[PDB]
Structure formats: structure tokens, C-alpha cells
């Protein structure tokens, strides 16, 4: 799953709504 | 949108040169400031997190068959929690890493496509946030060295 793969590559791309 | 294409091509050209793809390839002041700030931010990002985007084309199956909407789908995961300047920098750095890797793996055809994909993604997905958050002149104020 591309989406899963992507999520791995960008694990550190998290944060808030704001 | 033309300025978005130019920013993408400036950044990717910079990253390819910096890695020494001057030889895999046959060889305003307001916008200059934007380009320089983005180059420096992308360098900073890469110095901070350079394990982050290794072996991309393999993990993401980016090939000469890949269509824009697969790139879009991947990048959407980067902005899953919303857009900010740090993730926009990450986006540019990702694209740069994809370009370098593509050249390294003898898939040079991808460089012009990645640049088109980034410009589209910027215009359609990121520009609406940018134009609510001060535009690139505000990015310069935040991340420009000077």
C-alpha cells in the first residue's frame, strides 16, 4: 500500500490542527 | 504559478548541482530572496534529518510509469496534519531527494516529471495555505538568514 509506504517515509510529518 | 514553477526548478537545480550532477547533465531581488531562503532551509532540513528520505523510489515505487496522482497521494501523507512552513520545506527536500535518487538510478526522465508534479502540487494544494499565511515574503522573514 502506497499510502502506508508514504506514512513510513513521513513518520515525522505530524503535529496539530493549528 | 510561474513563480511556483521557477521556485521548484531553482531548488531542484540547486540540489542536483550540490550533489555533483552538473556532469550527468549537458550544461528580481524579491524572488532571489525567496529562492535563497528555501535553498538554505532545505539544506538545514537535510542536515537535521538526512536518514528521513533514503531509498525513496524503491519504497514508493516511483518509476517511468508513475502518474502524477501517485506522487500526490504520497505527498498528501506528508501534509496529513495540515500545512506549515516546515512541512513545505520538507516537501521541497523530498522532491530534491527523489530527483537525486532518480539520477543515481539512471531514471533521469523522472527529473522533469518530479518538477512538474511539485509545481502542480504547490499550485493546487499548498498555495491556498501560503496565501493565507503571508506568502513567500513571510517565509523569508521566518527562515531567511540575512
Which residue ranges make up each domain of chain B?
Answer: 2-143
**What are the C-alpha distances in Å from B68 to residues A13, B18, B60, B63, B145?**
21, 26, 13, 11, 34
Q: Name chain B contacts of A13, Cβ cutoff 8 Å.
A: 77-81, 87, 90
- Contact yes or no for B80 and A8 at CB 8 A: no
The coordinates were experimentally obtained by X-ray
CATH architecture under which domain B2-143 falls: Orthogonal Bundle (1.10)
- Contact yes or no for B73 and A13 at CB 8 A: no
Say if residues B56 and B98 touch (Cβ distance below 8 Å). yes
Say if residues B85 and B142 touch (Cβ distance below 8 Å). yes
Rounded Cα gap, residues B124 and B107, in angstroms:
26
Q: Name chain B contacts of A10, Cβ cutoff 8 Å.
A: 77-78, 80, 90
Of all residues in chain A, the one with the smallest CA distance to B88 is: A13
**The three cell numbers locating residue A1:** 500500500
Amino acid at each position: 500500500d502506497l499510502g502506508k509506504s508514504a506514512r513510513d517515509v513521513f513518520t515525522k510529518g505530524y503535529g496539530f490542527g493549528l
